[PDB]
């Protein structure tokens, strides 16, 4: 079909090679996943050595690692913002490796409040009338508030992250190949990584 052959194209000198053999089967290429954000669709491709390769074609779920205190869930992938390869990979909302995507914040806001015992984002004056997340912040014993007391001094998150939670949309980097492995897994941008990619979102806007 399409091939990866190291004989069809030119020399260092610009001289052209004559073909000694016709396209070999081990010199194989296949059509790309071009994997979308929709309800999950992953096809199976049989590859060299009768092994199994998982073409993700539509993909909503994926694993996103929070950088600083290592909390990672099966999170929804809501948008594609930036792709350093091609700006046409962004518009046609395609997940590839080193994509700058948007995900759900609330699976990691749920971990923060369970662990750090403080409201994260939340425009101040807003109250929860069911009152279940306020149970997940307060209502502890004597000596185990001390376990939280010494955790409140390692609590102050990056202020660039906090606004993503306040909007409810975390900027994340795809660190897996969804077309090859069959997962849109990755990690959450923090610090100078985010402060870079946020400028390339302003650079696009005008």
């Amino acid at each position: 079909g399409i091939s990866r052959d190291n004989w069809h194209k030119r020399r260092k000198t610009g001289g052209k090679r004559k073909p000694y053999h016709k396209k070999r089967k081990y010199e194989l290429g296949r059509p790309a996943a071009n994997t979308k954000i929709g309800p999950r669709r992953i096809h199976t491709v049989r590859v060299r050595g009768g092994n199994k390769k998982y073409r993700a074609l539509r993909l909503d779920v994926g694993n996103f690692s929070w950088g600083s205190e290592c909390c990672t869930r099966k999170t929804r992938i809501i948008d594609v913002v930036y792709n350093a390869s091609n700006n046409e990979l962004v518009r046609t909302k395609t997940l590839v490796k080193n994509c700058i995507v948007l995900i759900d914040s609330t699976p990691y806001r749920q971990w923060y409040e369970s662990h750090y015992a403080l409201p994260l984002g939340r425009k101040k004056g807003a109250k929860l009338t069911p009152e279940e997340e306020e149970i997940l912040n307060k209502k502890r014993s004597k000596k185990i508030q001390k376990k939280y007391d010494e955790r409140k001094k390692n609590a102050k998150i990056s202020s660039l992250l906090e606004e993503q939670f306040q909007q409810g949309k975390l900027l994340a980097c795809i660190a897996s190949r969804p077309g090859q492995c069959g997962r849109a897994d990755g990690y959450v941008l923090e610090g100078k990584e985010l402060e870079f990619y946020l400028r390339k979102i302003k650079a696009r806007k005008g």
Binding site: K12, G67, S68, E69, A84, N98, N154, E190, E193, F196
Partner: protein, 143 residues
Amino acid sequence: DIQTERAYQKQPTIFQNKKRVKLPRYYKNIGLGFKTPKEAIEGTYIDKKCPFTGNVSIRGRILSGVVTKMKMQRTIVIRRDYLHYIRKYNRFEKRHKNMSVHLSPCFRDVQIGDIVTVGECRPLSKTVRFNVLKVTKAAGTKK
């Protein structure tokens, strides 16, 4: 400095967003008893095809030549002169193979004519299969 490419330029091993209240820089010994230079350890550059601050393992042959072109970016052209014995005409003939060689930016102040040691590795590009392991300064050349 860095980060005038589209993607975020970093080393893929060291993590640089860890909680607190100079970056931690990845470097390995290249092997074969070659010194890892100061600028590869102290420096602020970042290159995946650098054998000091990157994932490229030097294996097989170690060759040497003279630097002839430095117009490709983060890679150069060396020139390797040798003599070929013909057994009929019991004489030699001056030949050369000018192979494309990856010049790590740790080897900063290189000039053309400098003698350069190369180490065989996995193919970096179409024609580049060799990283620079040390740049010795050319014959004379105080300046």
